[model samples]
Target: NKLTLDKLDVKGKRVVMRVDFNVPMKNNQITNNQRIKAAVPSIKFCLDNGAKSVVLMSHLGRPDGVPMPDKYSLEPVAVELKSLLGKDVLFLKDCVGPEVEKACANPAAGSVILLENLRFHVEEEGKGKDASGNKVKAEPAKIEAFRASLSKLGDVYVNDAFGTAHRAHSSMVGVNLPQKAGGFLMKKELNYFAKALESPERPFLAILGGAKVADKIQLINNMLDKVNEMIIGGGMAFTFLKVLNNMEIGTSLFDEEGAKIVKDLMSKAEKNGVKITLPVDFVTADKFDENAKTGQATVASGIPAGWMGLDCGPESSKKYAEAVTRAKQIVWNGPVGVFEWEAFARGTKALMDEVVKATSRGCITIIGGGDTATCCAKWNTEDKVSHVSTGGGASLELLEGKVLPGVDALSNI
Candidate 1:
């Protein structure tokens, strides 16, 4: 079991916590406040449990190692949080450096301070130019400096941003003053992930879909051992489809490198007796647009030149739904198609409906976070599933049986 907030003595301590307030913004306003609301328990616990002060820090968007251009600032998030928490939130413009440390030196009990975007400073991430000049995880010097300055903000550390828990950035693991533990939301994520890997029911089915195979390559590779069956869809499936007799997928997003990986995976799956399924046909489009001319075609006949596959055809959905109906456990991540468009949403909606049906029948269904989580919530199937995860990258790492440094850095019970 992970060492959670309840296990720590937080009373009278200055608690610095990491949260996922990376809410989507438009016109300098928050578009969705769900991620902010998820942190209520952890923040409130630090305040309500007699903590001297709760210092919360989070990264909003990609500032690319520079301060926000005011467009991506955390100012709007502080406003949204104040309204949600029904308290005055101290908004600090900077995450580290002098003036910021002085404010933390003296604070009233139960007070809350929200720091600016941590990504505003590049050092927040231990990533720098490697010998090959690639921006990979780098030496500890900058990371240590980044952590040491903020380390004075509190006497303890709490990581609540499960959405970014897989990253080894400074905020996730580098910064700590003695005690460190997972917050309530972080613990919830771990518990559900535990069930998926530890004691899942029989006839387990794992479904993956997304724009590219590169993002979930490890997840796809690792699940071959644990799951009984697998389903592939979305733009990533075209790569696998290409493996079968060089299917003509004109202008569609198919990765040549991924095709080899799919072929190797297919051979391994076949030898392991794992039933792997891919879309037999797709909703073909002549142009990549919402209003693009579209039609349905069988998978046996390759996609025509200048035509792209946007979503799965009816036949593939029927077969995938049938498999979902029989599964005792299912973990679905990513959408089967461009779910945002009206014309191509049918495939994902159909699968979501089938997942809801299986969930109603006592099947354990877990929706991996990010695009997949958004799809379930958008399709109104979020509450119908067993668990809708909060972290996509972190969840993938856990499913791959890889330890996340964010969670690993925490003090164990």
Candidate 2:
């Protein structure tokens, strides 16, 4: 556990707030307001509890250094943030220097201000450095100056950017104070994952489905020690099917370098007495498409050339549903199929229906977000699940037992 905002004496103090508002945009439009809405609680906690103006800092979408236009600016976000706060959210043009200090100096308590994209400066998220913090893309001297300047804008530091928890960017990694702490949402994320892995109920199950085994290599290896049973699906299944079962899966996305890792996992599972199951059948397609021609076939009779498996077929779906129905605790990431296309979404849909059913029976189901979270959104089961993580990369890294630099840099209890 780390120091948190609840423990701080925040009355009349300037708060430097770091939150992940890297929202998706289209034609200078804000497509998703989830991240912005998600940040409300932490900001409200500080302001409502008597903190002076909270200087909110966050990065928008990834825009390279320079040539960064007004399109990438938080002007649009400022409007929405102000609406959410039901109070004026002053959006600053830059994150450092006298202009920022002037905006932040001795403001009224319970107020909030938003900052521009920190990535506007190359030193904010540049490359790794040497022993002297020199010869790096982020100029060490300037970055240190910027970090120090940011610290002065607030008497306290609160990190609520779970999405960027693993990133070692300047605001995330460099700024620290004794009052440094994780925000409310940050505490929620850490608590849920701890509950999932630390003392989960029996019949604990883990379901992993994705395009490539490579994307989930670390995740799979890490879960072997914790799960009672495991389910593998999606394009990643073909690689395991080909490597371990020696089945032919034509043109399917197979992990080319997965054989040895597959072997290692199978051995680990066997030794640990963990049941690792693979899909027995698939929804074969003539071509990968939103409207691809489809047919059902057993994984035993692998597809011919030009044919590929896009979703788990009825038999595989049935088996996965059975396992999900019996689970007492669950962690799901990725989708069982190409759920983006209505035609190929059945397997993922069916499997998640069972997850929801299990939740109804008191099974705690945690979705690790990303594609699986998208599937949950499509299913309209976000509330039904125990927790749907906002941080996909952060969740994956944490479940793999890795320390997040951004989180680790903060003060601990």
Candidate 3:
């Protein structure tokens, strides 16, 4: 079931929630508040449900264990959140101690208080012992002291930081040992991932792109049974093309080991009833540089000696779009090309636009990884899709059907 804010009885209670405030910052100013904005529903849900006050805990960038100028503050985020919520968000000087306790003990109902960076504490980086008396940190006593202090503040623990869901740190896993389930965001992420990967509607399509073939090998192998068609593009496609026939790719990135594996996987995919689609044509450039002259080449028997394939050609884009439009559910990761450059961005952009259209027509579209997420935001299509995952390695790991250490550490209901 999709976890909603309505599940918790937060009235007159002190809620300690973990959110991903790890936003980009420049000169002590917040550059992007998208993560913070995504968290508004839960925070507002707490207040609206009669919670006396909400105590928010988040760690911005790695401060290690000491206070440094660039990494020591969340002042910019606190200000932006206040502006976004249009409510005064109180800032505590520290995360755990007498000051934080006093603030939470008496915060007025419907108010909020944001703690300072949790990583500033020496013990927060997993320097403690587990309940089995095994060394949580090599120096178990020090880590225990830190964990015990933070655990005393709230009646419940809510993890809304999907970006850090793969981490097994104190806030993500430690506090949850003796508490209730996490926030709505965590639940939604896991639920959707399960929906798309485990029981997705038939005619499932997997669209993969970007630079490395090695990164997606295991995921593709794992999903072969469930996916009807696996569309391959980006730089990784070259490795596959190189294997199909020893193409002269020039300077384009190619993996000799990956090529062998791609050939094996191609046979395996066919045996598993999955169609592996490779580009029929490509956009090639004389040199790998930005100003290098580019041309469209038919997906010939082989790439010529001096040219490198950079993007899928117009024909390939149209073909991929047609496949996407026919799919019942689509899982997208990576970019079709070096989408940051306008010249090579057509394929990725075109495919993404088609995914948007498919989503509008009732297809469940899931976009994963950092670059793919950036592409969606670049085109201003993030809101139009079904779900855009915040975790890159974690999402890929999930696609490969592996259990995450952080999620495994949570208290099972």
Candidate 4:
């Protein structure tokens, strides 16, 4: 029911596209070009299909609605994109205004223009800090003007930035066009998720991790409704272990608020006939540090009073691997351990190997974005998974059954 680029008639039309070129940078150099590369499919498609001009819009960082091109500029992105597209991409000085409109009014056919960072103006985000660092909100009329100015840039709109889909920024929802469709990257992100959510192969498993159970309550509840099995790991697992088994979690992460709902979640999972798995053991540590003194303990043995559980134990990883091997579809979010540190990465590494093995066995293995996606990148196993989500919050919200404003803004079929 959603319109995509293939459904739109872009020939002889100016296509305004929203893409997530917000990438990591180190001294003005792009550390990773995956995001820029992700949008190439849609941009290339427009050029290949005879679009009059493809106008690309993106916001790099929190410029706080002020023009600080030196630090928060898209110029580096423009250069990277130029090298990626293998064509001259005209980088505009500003995103909107008379000069900007004049430049975009009538471009040559099959041309690409990358607009300046959209976040340069407060109107794009609707709010920012004042000169004195006081919070400020843009006037409604001004926001409308900005949107209208942007609307004049193109005949059709294409949104390919799944990474920013969760935010209802002006660029995401303000484009006025007869055809507002999703680009290839957005379509691919949605299609893969929709297939998993709507009709899974069978034995669907959800691997949940992260720091707080409170942060992932909705995600856990929603997954319980769809998945056949669930694996709870990471620091949040301590909360579950503490609440359900009355085990001493030491100084490990325990969400008191989340503990109140632990029994509720378990009952719901039971009612849904879903099996929930918790780590039976942990890699204990004396302190949260890179070189913290490490120890090992089981749920029955209980972690010491002065120690915290930083990673799941080997036995728990083996159990998770077995569960993954049995699942036909797997969606992994968050790292099961403090994987950023080598000392506490064994459990997550083992899990990654198992998921990769499952993928080779024809299991649909999805690595949800954020830390889990970083894990895949760290291990160089991104291609081994069925789908690695490009958006962390967007994918999390989708898994929680919440609608994305950027996706919802697209024309419905």
**CA-lDDT, candidates in order:** 0.85, 0.83, 0.78, 0.92
Write candidate 1's Cα lDDT for 68-162 as tens digits: 64867898888888899998899999999888999887788778899999887777765544334456554567767788988899999999999
TM-scores for the candidates? 0.92, 0.94, 0.90, 0.96
- Model 2 / residue 73 / CA error / Å: 2.3
In candidate 1, stretches whose alpha carbon ends up further than 4 angstroms from where it belongs are 128-142
Candidate 4 local accuracy as lDDT?
Answer: 0.92
Model 3 TM-score on a 0 to 1 scale: 0.90
Ranking by TM-score: 4, 2, 1, 3
lDDT of 3 by residue, 1-413 (tens): 22234566777887788888888788788766777887888898888888888778888887665655355687777888899899999888788887778778767777788888887765777543343445444346766666666666676666777777777777767773245455667777777888888899768999988788887778889888679888998988888877886665776788767877987889989899887788878887887767678877665645666878888988999889878977989989889887888778888889988999999989999988578988887899988899987766678878898876556655565
For model 2, residues 1-413, the per-residue Cα lDDT tens digits are 57888897788889998998888788887876767888899888888888987999987766544326576887688789998889898888988889888888777767688888877766678653444535447567887897888888898899999888989888898885667898888888888888778888868899988888876778888888888889988889888888878888888887877755888888888998778878999888889888888877677788777788999988998899877877899999888888889888898889888998899999989998577776766778988988888788898888897988878888878
State how far residue 318 of model 3 sits from its true place (Å): 1.8
Whose lDDT is greatest here? Answer: 4
Q: Model 2, which residues run further than 4 Å from truth?
A: 128-136
| CA RMSD of each candidate after superposition | 2.9, 3.1, 4.2, 1.4
Tell me the lDDT of model 3 at 208: 83
| Best candidate, TM-score | 4
Residue ranges of candidate 4 with Cα displaced over 4 Å: none
